[PDB]
Point group: D2
Chain length 329, copies 4
């Protein structure tokens, strides 16, 4: 039978995760929680500036969303103590609030009968971290895990291929990243100077720990990677720009062939290669965590390389969260 899941937090990730679950037979959505009334929940689920209109009926009956005739319980509580997800059948909670990123906070779900919690972001403690195609084979049945970040689910698969074929001595990453709800529409108070600046009218440097944290899913890369983000005025879709020194001389063609081989085998459904010279909008609603743009791969002086890989920072990660629920179930 299909694993039954609940989504805590009905934001960009939570709603993309719900749409993907509704497309599949191997997982079933039984409950959600946000701080939104049901009329706004329905409206944001039905209509999406980025991913288009949900095809199918989006109704309500009290505090049930009814999607293509199936009832989904809607809670509306900031407090984990009021969220009896397991009473509605939930085996796994997808933790999409950004607010509960320690095992201590997630333990309440397990206490209330949930079997597993998956954090939709890097843990703030030493919660075990798993990324499909990267270290998912090492999963030991832990109750609480992190699925890392959207960037990790792009950079991670790229590093898996480079490490396994050539070896990584060191590297630095820039993500050219879509703006997010963490940013300001106009110059206004936010958690730091640069995030306070108008997101759709600037290139905005922002931090990411995605690269240093690769040590969690690839311990061989401990101390060998750092990175940063440059937020640009697109609503969705981002790129990993990885510059690395490999352990031996390689060619562009060799690098791209290694990616196409992984795309057909160990990273099927996870990493693909673009040989059509697409641009960012072409990857809107793409389920792959990494799309290597083969023509952009560069090598200089034998061992010094650049790889550009696209990711739908919403849909790729959301697809991995759903894949990860099915896998650990």
């Amino acid at each position: 039978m299909a694993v039954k899941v609940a989504i805590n937090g009905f934001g960009r990730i939570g709603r993309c995760v719900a749409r993907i679950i509704l497309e599949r037979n191997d997982i079933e959505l039984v409950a959600i929680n946000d701080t939104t009334d049901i009329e706004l929940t329905k409206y944001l689920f039905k209509y999406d500036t980025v991913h288009g209109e949900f095809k199918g009926s989006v109704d309500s009956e009290g505090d049930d969303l009814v999607v293509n005739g199936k009832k989904i319980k809607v809670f509306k509580s900031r407090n984990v103590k009021d969220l009896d997800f397991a009473k509605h059948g939930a085996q796994i909670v997808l933790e999409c609030t950004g607010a509960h990123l320690t095992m201590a906070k997630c333990q309440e779900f397990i206490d209330m009968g949930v079997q597993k919690v998956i954090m939709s972001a890097p843990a703030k403690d030493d919660t075990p971290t798993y990324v499909l195609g990267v270290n998912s084979e090492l999963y030991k049945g832990e109750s609480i895990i992190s699925n890392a970040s959207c960037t990790t689910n792009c950079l991670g698969p790229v590093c898996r291929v480079l490490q396994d074929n050539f070896g990584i001595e060191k590297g630095l990453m820039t993500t050219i990243h879509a703006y997010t709800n963490g940013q300001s529409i106009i110059d206004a108070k936010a958690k730091d100077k640069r995030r306070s600046r108008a997101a759709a009218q600037n290139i905005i440097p922002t931090s990411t720990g995605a690269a240093k944290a690769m040590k969690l899913v690839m311990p061989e890369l401990n101390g060998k990677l750092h990175g940063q983000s440059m937020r640009v005025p697109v609503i969705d879709v981002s790129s990993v720009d990885l510059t690395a020194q490999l352990s031996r001389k390689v060619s562009k063609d060799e690098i791209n062939e290694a990616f196409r081989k992984a795309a057909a085998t160990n990273l099927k459904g996870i990493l693909m290669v673009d040989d059509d010279e697409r641009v960012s909008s072409d990857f809107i609603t793409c389920s792959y965590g990494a799309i290597v743009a083969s023509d952009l791969t560069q090598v200089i002086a034998d061992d010094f390389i650049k790889v550009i890989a696209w990711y739908d920072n919403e849909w790729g990660y959301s697809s991995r969260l759903v894949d990860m629920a099915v896998y650990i179930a």
Copy 2:
């Protein structure tokens, strides 16, 4: 001597008001309040995506902003009871928080020794409303007033000219309006459905009461005007699109000549006429409340007219708030 003022709320309006006060000799800024630490206050005041870098030194000494060597007291309190503006010399409070739009709330400033409060938005009670060039001549020395909205300070001057020259039987307004901090950067919870949608990637209908509320500053227009807003992906600058039936036959040339005449006389510094076929960006940091685009003026069937007037929805209104402080002082 220059009137001494304080700004409550250091947002888009509050910071534009502060820059304009610093350009003038007839008014002096002695204090501000927001909920922001001083490092972020300085950064947002110095650097502006829309209006460019402040020319001149922006320093701090404890909880004083120091601008071109002059000290400005910075409070940081949500509660009007902690804001002794008058202790720092403030005669007028420019109420730029959006949070204190009744005489009851503003009365606390007067109780604590402020002589006058000007609301930076339409009042939610029957606080007297004044708009320069429209009904400012009727000011009776009231302690608490509203300066109405950015839209009123565009529509109002346009209606003054049309009413005084031709007569207005009825009309409907659309503002093609820049996005604002009331809107969402990505599809996310906001106070209504349409405001929840990504502001820089949509045309977004939104309400404005600016037209019905014209009855406050032009009672002859009671029951004769309604309007609405269409929010579009520009960071700043908006247009009033007024369609009206006048009391007699007019020509395009007659309408435009009436506007140029007011621009030279009763609406000097308030309404101007564009005869250069400018676009919206050309009015960034323009102090005029209304810029009639003369070539866009239309008449059909004798008495049925359209006027398009630009406004820097930040700078024009901010310039009027400062003008209004000087005028009532």
Copy 3:
């Protein structure tokens, strides 16, 4: 059997028209022409920033595009004399170049064996003009016709309903319009001052004759309508903002009910009513020529009304061109 058509001009309209023809059984695409090599034709047809990836195989075999295994002849000639569309079976030419908008120019297609030409824009001569749901019933089998503009196929259906139910005395229209290939990406030479200005960073007034030209499809509106356009930074989807004086007192509810009634009957598939408070992105790839936003309908002083109707300025018009080929065939 399905009417066989050719598309001259493989731009935004030409490629949307081709995608719609490929979705339908009652019309078949046999040939296209542009000034583009086949590799770029394939790329622009397959990948679309606005309407998303074409689902299905896009290949070539010499100067045939092969779409889901069907061969489409691709010409590459500026000169109508080199375009033997009828030799590849074409009965109707959809004239999507913007360059051949007189009967004199289109006569060459008829001379070379084409039975009918439909211009994808208003005629520059007295070519008969037809708009579905507006005056299509009057079609007399003419060989060469204009389908008017994207704006006419929105305004036209709106006026049909208002005229037939209430009567139109006079009105003025503004379209809040997506930027187009007629505009400049950065401030650079174009055919006029305002079109020379950066399209994605300005509100840009531009002319439209759509309103005065309504006399071609609704002669009763001769001398009663004018309009103008305000180009705003969205890539696609526009709105008609019609302000009109009707022949009698009406209510908002009466106006909206008249539109829903036409939506179910005489304007089925042509005009619909939005009762869900959508924004512009929600109408991307919508086939309706007009989507009345019911909650935005306004009436003041009995007879003075405003109607806001969305249109996918690419897809709605393209859907009408295809409908018009099927209808006249």
Copy 4:
């Protein structure tokens, strides 16, 4: 006396170059050429979406632009044979057309009495290439030179400092670059697939030879650098993202101190360091070729570094062209 110059090509670079010349006393603009009538020349020079309104009078008298009362001859000819710049006093021609990037083409100006030509882009032949602060000291009085690209005038100064202090073994560059007139406003035919895609709605990979061509101004870097561009939806301002392996271990602080030292000495007016955490809009109309964002400087594993440096891709380069005319005069 001030060097007298002419501008061939009145585009983004040509008009920014003209505004900078008008701010300075050491150079004088005597003539321009474009393919634009005088009314449009005046309009585009006076009003600028990016750099704001020209302060001062912009008039015409026949085929003279009159700027703050000074007459500038305006030619309007595609053919260098009709451009007697030297007859109007021009000693140096700033070649801003993008169309004359070989010594053979520029020789006609010298034949017609011009003393020096500076190309506003990389040469397509072996025209000598000079970049201020990088190899300008080696200038030998050549008649025809290239000022390289906007990217070279950012990357070049950054490499000068890194090479002189630490040594560069190898590196790869990405520019996160503002869209340009080389790109399409909507999906439409351009010179390649990716440039055909809507510039304000995509991240668009594009080539730059700026890095390999560094061998022209720094021969020690022959074979050690490659790069690429990612075009993003900002109208202006770009960043060099340089990842390099240096000849020895360095620290972040050491790298940033080397840049501040060059900023005060050998690269005064050319490279500066941002210690204020600015974003892209803050560098609009900035004259520096490179603005190193000090907080973004990264080092991993001793010798593997990343430097992010902003550049106003219009104003920085234009300022260098004017500096280069003054220098070689």
